[PDB]
Amino acid sequence: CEADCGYERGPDPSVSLLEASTGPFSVRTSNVSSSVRGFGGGTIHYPTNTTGTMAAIVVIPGFVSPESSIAWWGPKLASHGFVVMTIGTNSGFDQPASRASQLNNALDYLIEQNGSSRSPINGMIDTDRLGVMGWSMGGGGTLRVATEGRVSAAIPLAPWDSSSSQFRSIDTPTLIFACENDSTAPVRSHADPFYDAIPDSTAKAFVELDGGGHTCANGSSGFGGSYNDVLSRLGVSWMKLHLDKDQRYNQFVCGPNHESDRSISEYRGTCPYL
Template structure:
């Protein structure tokens, strides 16, 4: 704030002009004090927010940040040989290169029937660059059924948190699971068997078991409207509908998409997977804006159901 440029006709050094010059000192002091107090309030508020949720990672999200091919974190990766582990078939770990933000939540991802980790590899760097440690795994055989794939997802998380070379970067209390097709069915099995998991995302999941009332993990079920291998009416929809109504749950049906949509880079899958993992693994309510109010049908979304606001 500056004093008005208007001055009286008084000559320099006269009373009124001298009074205005003298009053600027106290005025500037008051303004400086107010600015300092405002800055202190902002700092305290920021500190309070950080104290409320120490798990937030990365800058505040935007539509462009959750749909971008990469997030703000540089990503490194390391291979895990199937011969060096037990309980699953090895895989690849993707993780934020920097350690400046401390430990990260983690997610293990399983492929589908007859598939290798390469079929879901695109999710590795995409999710890791948003602030997660991501383990895309191979299964012991390509024909393992959902229950076995669920066990293998849990074995992979145990390896990741207890034995892997990046275990110091992982917060073992904040873990999730994802999977495609039979890996999606395995995702439900893993969530049922380990209620402490923070998030589960079955992608066009397949499982003979259609009922999951035991699950206590926030679950985003992703189906595809043109899926003929795991049709939504006999798989993803009953999976979702059988989840407890009190659970944080959602059903995303991809529009004009088939069973193998999760095998290639997909912005819609990425956007809602990132938002779900951030919301429930990191407890980052900044991502609630992408989940509530419920997304409406669009060129890429045939249907979206869920509970809002979320309770966890």
């Protein structure tokens, strides 16, 4: 459904809530062995004190990178009312197109586990409200999955891919995080043309972060992590807005002056959405 569908959860939000180190819920974890079919294992994060179903999200890493490179997003998102699996790839050599098939395989796995007597998330997932996230080549895999129209939200992080024309099929709400000093996936050859290739009719957002390099959109529990608040405020809201059709989180994506944030170097968007 697109409006007043009854997927909303938690309080009416504010900025202090969004930028807290955790959402209103408590986080647990369930291991996925690397023997899992379709990807190289992961960790499932879930709230403990909620009711009702919730959207599923999968987060994939980039080239020769372990799941831990993006695993900050697992707890940060689960604590706001999501089921969130951070995954590892079959091989660190996997290129965008493989990383997209593994996105879909890990979404398929999550759907299977929602029906598994042995899963801590059995009956906790609405298997129609799915989101994807990815760093670098996994950010290209995210954009590729955003062309299929199964997922209702995509957040690429420092995306890397090779062809940009394929993204004119993207009708899925996509928020691309970019890093201004990205030498690995240069903005001007990657994030920038991927955003531009998305139709203006699609709800989309380009949030370039100020001064940061290739890992600036991954979050961090210690070293780095000056971007945690833009990531938390805009990422959680984007997922709350488009996975939970929760208009109460519209005010943080459409309405503010984003470049006024010291951490935001360039914002582009298509506000208003619907």
